[PDB]
Structure formats: C-alpha cells, structure tokens
C-alpha cells in the first residue's frame, strides 16, 4: 500500500498526478507534498488545489467525496484540519453533469440555448455566491459548474 501512505480506493476516483506518479514523488520518509494537486471522480467532478498540498498519510477515500452536483471534503470535522491545512485549504471545485430538469418533461435540459434562456449559470453562480464560493464558470456541454472555495 502506497509510499506516502495515501489511500484512494473508491472506483472512479483518481488524482492528478496519478497515485502511481505521486508515489515516485513521495520521499524516503513516506512524506509527500505536491504542487497543483487534483482529486477527481470520473463523470461527477473534481477538486483542484493549486500549489503545495501535503497528501502525507491522507486517506482520500474517507476525506473527499465527489457526488452529483455536490462535493464534500472532510465528512464530519472529526479529522478536519485547521483551515489552510491538508485539503481544508482553498480549492477549485468542479462539478460535472450539472443540469436542471423541467418539472414537466423531467428529462434534464442541455440545450445551451434553453439554459441560456433560463439563465441557469445565473442561478448556479447565485448559489455559489450564497455558499460563500466564487463562481468561476459553467460549461453546458458537460454540465460543468466550476467554482472556487476558500476552505471546506
């Protein structure tokens, strides 16, 4: 099991650099710091931390959960580090597959035209603002709702 002591097992979840890479980068003491790190879950989203991050002995499985239209880092503050620490730092949440669904058809909505007309971004960015995040963008092709958080 991983040199840095990192744990990422959930199927679909991955990292940038890959765990495999990350291992090489980890030092002779199990320690492992990496700049511009990314933890993602194919098809759901990904969180990106720019700059140095200390993955040392981090059990990502337990810590980061990336679900549809919703990401959560550090479930309950049982092991949640002080801000600026671990993954509790600032990051760029990216939530894929985000789209609204009309009450009638209940068949989602992907028409960039339909979205644009209903101003989905608007609402999205609205929420992000309320949650204390800085709306970054919205890629309708892939229902990607990217936004920055200060901490988690």
């Amino acid at each position: 099991m991983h040199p840095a002591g990192i744990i990422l097992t959930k199927v679909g979840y991955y990292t940038i650099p890959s765990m495999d890479d990350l291992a090489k980068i980890t030092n002779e003491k199990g320690e492992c710091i990496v700049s511009d790190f990314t933890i993602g879950r194919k098809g759901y989203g990904s969180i990106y931390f720019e700059g140095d991050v200390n993955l040392t002995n981090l059990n990502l499985d337990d810590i980061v959960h990336i679900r549809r239209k919703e990401v959560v880092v550090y479930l309950d503050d049982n092991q949640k580090p002080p801000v600026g620490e671990g993954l509790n730092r600032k990051a760029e949440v990216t939530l894929d597959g985000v789209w609204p669904t009309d009450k009638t058809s209940r068949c989602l909505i992907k028409s960039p035209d339909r979205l644009a007309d209903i101003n989905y971004e608007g609402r999205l960015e609205a929420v992000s603002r309320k949650q204390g995040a800085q709306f970054k963008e919205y890629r309708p092709e892939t229902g990607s709702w990217v936004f920055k958080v200060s901490h988690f």
Binding site: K69, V93, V98
Partner: peptide, 6 residues
C-alpha cells in the same frame, strides 16, 4: 458542503 441543494 458545496453543491446545488435544489
């Protein structure tokens, strides 16, 4: 927690 709670 960060997401759309629709």
């Amino acid at each position: 927690k960060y997401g759309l709670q629709d």
